[PDB]
Amino acid sequence: EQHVLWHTGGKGVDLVLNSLAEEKLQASVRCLATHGRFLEIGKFDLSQNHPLGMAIFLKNVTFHGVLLDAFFNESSADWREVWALVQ
Amino acid sequence: PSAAIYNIDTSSESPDHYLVDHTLDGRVLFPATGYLSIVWKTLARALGLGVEQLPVVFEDVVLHQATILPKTGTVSLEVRLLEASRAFEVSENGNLVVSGKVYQWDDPDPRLFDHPESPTEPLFLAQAEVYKELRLRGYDYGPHFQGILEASLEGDSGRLLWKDNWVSFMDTMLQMSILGSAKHGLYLPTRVTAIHIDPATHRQKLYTLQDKAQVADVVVSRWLRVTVAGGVHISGLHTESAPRRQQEQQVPILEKFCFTPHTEEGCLSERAALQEELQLCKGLEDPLLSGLLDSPALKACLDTAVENMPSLKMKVVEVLAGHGHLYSRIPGLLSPHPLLQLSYTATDRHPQALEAAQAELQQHDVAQGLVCNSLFSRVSLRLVGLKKSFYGSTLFLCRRPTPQDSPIFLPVDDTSFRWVESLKGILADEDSSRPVWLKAINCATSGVVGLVNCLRREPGGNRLRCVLLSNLSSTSHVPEVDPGSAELQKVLQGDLVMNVYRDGAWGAFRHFLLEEDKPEEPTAHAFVSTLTRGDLSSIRWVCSSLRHAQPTCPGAQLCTVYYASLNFRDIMLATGKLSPDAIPGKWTSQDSLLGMEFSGRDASGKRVMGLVPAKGLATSVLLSPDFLWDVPSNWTLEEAASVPVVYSTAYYALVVRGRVRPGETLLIHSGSGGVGQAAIAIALSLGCRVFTTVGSAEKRAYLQARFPQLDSTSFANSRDTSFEQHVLWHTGGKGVDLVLNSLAEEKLQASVRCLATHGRFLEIGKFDLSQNHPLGMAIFLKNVTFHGVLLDAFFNESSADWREVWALVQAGIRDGVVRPLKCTVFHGAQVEDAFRYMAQGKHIGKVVVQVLAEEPEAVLKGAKPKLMSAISKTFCPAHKSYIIAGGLGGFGLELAQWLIQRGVQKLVLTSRSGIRTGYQAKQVRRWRRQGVQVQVSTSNISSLEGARGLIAEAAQLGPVGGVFNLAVVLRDGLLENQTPEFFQDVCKPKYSGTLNLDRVTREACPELDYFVVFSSVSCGRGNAGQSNYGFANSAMERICEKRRHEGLPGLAVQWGAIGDVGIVSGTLPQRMASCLEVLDLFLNQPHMVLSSFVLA
Amino acid sequence: PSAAIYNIDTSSESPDHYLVDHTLDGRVLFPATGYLSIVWKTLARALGLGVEQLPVVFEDVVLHQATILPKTGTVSLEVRLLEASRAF
């Protein structure tokens, strides 16, 4: 957190691809810049229903819960897009 | 036993007596770190360890309420902590005030307290000016909390005192954190992320100075959002501004200083009631009976009598006080004069009168037994003044005869002040008992008025200096008069302290006349603002800064406004719940911030509508052409005023951010609101299934009439959480795809429980986000996206997305998707009514203000706004230059800041030395970073060549607009018995300097419009020690009078005691904010010399 | 005094003998609603009212651990509640 906040001039980053556990997810969300996007691909912190402070959304921030497992049941329209991108 | 209770006593003997030094704003508040101290003590007691042996860690500290400490009383705080849950709470009357987490560190790492390296100077900021700045900002800290020993200019490094007190130490760390940040108003901490304390490292990080004091180093890092000092480490401090108490403990006594002739003939004219009443009585207590009684003519006579009173003591006797009622006005008129002991007695020949005993109880006395409403010579009295009007009534006044002889005449009219020794010799012997008559003849530019005022109260020879002879013929040698033995006889017959001949008439200068209410001028550019914060009855039209400066840069354009729309932010700002600093933008100048959209005509007369970040409610708006749309021919401007912000927010939320696809389910909260209606229209145009929560049945009926594609299954109730069950049952337990939420707590959770898989939550509310309420992150297992949507971010940067939003809005306007809402029209003279109407949520659609009626034409070029009367205000063009003489210290810096906030881009400051103190350097650096070019010059003002060079240097930057004289040299404490010629000579840098300024401005300053000099009360009321000071100030007023008579601008202000920059003559210090406010009021007045002071 | 302590005994004479019928999997576990019962009783005692006279509301109940009831022994549960914070 201190490293990125010092090497970006106190602005932060635009995208965070987070796969770390508690007391590090909060650090990661504290590294977000304005109009930042948080991409959560972890499971433990989500499965335990840990709290999240909603004051971070005053920075015009988007929070994403990303799970690839949902494509094996329905919604093949997005899977075609992903397949085309991979190809 | 689990609840530890702490009693807080602020008595002189209590161990917690130091808390009396925490007076953030007229109120003693418990320090935010006192809660941490007591929680730490409670945890240490629970663990059975001492505080100094327990390294502790705080997390997610939240403050919910402010604790006020009464002077006579005691408050109790109960703290309970859950060791298993690792939490704590603080409550007073069972009401939560602090919550968070606390636990033992049990593994202290000293590397956490290493000072981070700064991203980036002999000058530094010392304690006195640091706390002067804090006092100016609002913080009235006391000696116990004044722990900042030294601070850097930018406020990122310094030194902190250690007094074996953690509360004061942490309060000083917070003070250092808030010092550097530049915000207007007081900011109190509300949320802190983490605090670490390691007392062993704290003791290891302390060093001693030569003064045998213990200090620690503090650094503040804004990039890392961390404040570390000694063994304390605060991270993620959050502060929010609090409203001003508005104590208004500085009531300004305001007057004007005028020359009053002794014999006023035909006064009380140009009236209204008296003129008609004269013929009404001719055809056929009372205004006609008392016309001159309430006029300021009586006040001048009363002031003259007071000045004639030998000592401050005065005895007044009322005769026949059974019919007349002048006893109810004389005591009131003497209140403004400070240090006056008045004994008033009412005597009536008939004791049966005087039934108003309660009126006499207002500091008056009763009794039973010269002013009255060829017999004068029979009593052998001397007539001083006569007041005759169109009432035939006459007001007389006779002096008290006091025989005297040996009239000493001393010619004061002379340079080099060699007469001072002669005056000392005349006033040397105490056993003189002979009047002294000062004479000024060959120079109307004499300040002997102030000298006689100050010398008259001198200890020893007080009554010796009796009167002056000043010939102030303020004309181009038009009149002519010369003194002499015959001329002296008329003056010497009446022993009057003041004897002034002004262009034909003999009289005296009066400092008793009061002032009037606000001035108004007819202008074409104005806006609306709340004169007093939080009051909706103080909303009026105020002249704007767009008239003086209209640069109209390529990325700007000036448009005339016909209709303006009101929003919720406007209500919050007007009623005071919202702070002006929450508005995003460079709004460091206190001004109106009301309005976000408008409709009218541009420079070419094209009918245009647009969106602005602020200052929407105005007669004209300057904005970039990017934030503009063309009104279609089928629309009128009235309904066009309601489109921009609503549809912009709706499109940005739905299309740009939500990326809604046709054939989806949406939940739109508060469907009757503007944003709700726009979202409904967009979703229906895209062909989507829509659920809307509605407040009442009438709103449901209106929505059904407006959108015929909605059925009875699409409506829910917005006043509770039943909409969750409704949507979950009508969607078969699946939920909706998009939620446009604008509802508060216990309804946001219900809304998020209505989300389906791959759902998108669009949050456009603020309260629940501002309070940092928790959100369960188990909802993200449903592959859900959470959106925080704020349109305000587009007014600063990232125009790429704004172009997309603009294109979407334009495309919607091209087809029939975008429809104007219904509007309620309020005229421009009823803005208060509009605010009151919208304050209650009984309206449907939009509330708009008709600034100007729409013309029937289509392209009306040259649409000059109609003239409108508004409150006058002072603004300056950006192409001019202004000079402040001696403005590099005290009042000068504050005046320069005030002028800069009013639109000044070129400043020249003169001082004997350079920038010496760190405060001046900090102010100059901050002003230079703002884009204002400021020059400090060492050119003298008393020399002709120095004044010419200074004026040339100022003109090099640009045309000179105004000159402000603030230079002062104080040879004070100089009684007349020890006053030499040299000291009174050196006490005149604002005499030769002012004369040179006058001459040079008259020579080569044809665009000048401001000419301001700063006087003092001692020039009109007198002070013992400042004789030469008053002498300078009086003639500095005289020159202003002459230059005003000549037609050029001229103003002199008599200031009382001024605080925030350090009682004189019984006058309390005046706060800087009130000083600037009264200065702004004075600058628009038509009088030449004005006074301002606070009575003791 | 703020911490109410409850002793759970599964003996044949104890009033809480019926808890022996909770054997989810070869193990006697404290019922998830026994916690609600004891918290309700503690709140009623704190308010000075009977359980049958106190309508109560629970919110955001989270279970962190499973309590095993030994056949020969006794476990003690301490319940503490913060009236101002409205938690337990």
Residue numbers in the entry:
A (entry chain B): 1729 to 1815
B (entry chain A): 857 to 976, 981 to 1144, 1211 to 1295, 1313 to 1316, 1379 to 2067, 2079 to 2112
C (entry chain B): 857 to 944
What does the original paper state about this entry?
In mammals, fatty acid synthase (FASN) contains multiple enzymatic domains to catalyse all chemical reactions needed for de novo fatty acid synthesis. An ACP carries substrates from one enzyme to another, sequentially following the chemical reactions. In metazoans, all essential enzymes are included in a single polypeptide chain and are arranged into two main functional domains, each carrying out a key chemical process and named correspondingly the condensing and modifying domains. The entire cycle of fatty acid synthesis requires that ACP carries the substrate from one enzyme to another repeatedly. Here, using a strategy of tagging and purifying endogenous FASN in HEK293T cells for single-particle cryo-electron microscopy studies, we characterized the structural dynamics of endogenous human FASN.
Focusing on these subsets, we refined the condensing and modifying wings separately to high resolutions with the best to 2.5 Å and 2.7 Å, respectively, from the 1,3-DBP sample. From these two separate reconstructions, we generated a composite map of human FASN incubated with 1,3-DBP, in which an ACP is seen bound to the KS domain. This composite map is of sufficient quality for accurate modelling of most of the modifying and condensing wings. For the modifying wing, we also applied symmetry expansion followed by 3D classification to separate particles of the modifying domain into two main categories, with (about 32%) and without (about 68%) well-resolved Ψ-domains attaching to β-ketoreductase (KR). Comparison between the two reveals motions of the Ψ-domains against the rest of the modifying domain, which remains stable. Both KR and Ψ−KR have a Rossmann-like fold, containing two α-helical domains separated by a β-sheet. ACP is linked to KR in the modifying wing with a short linker.
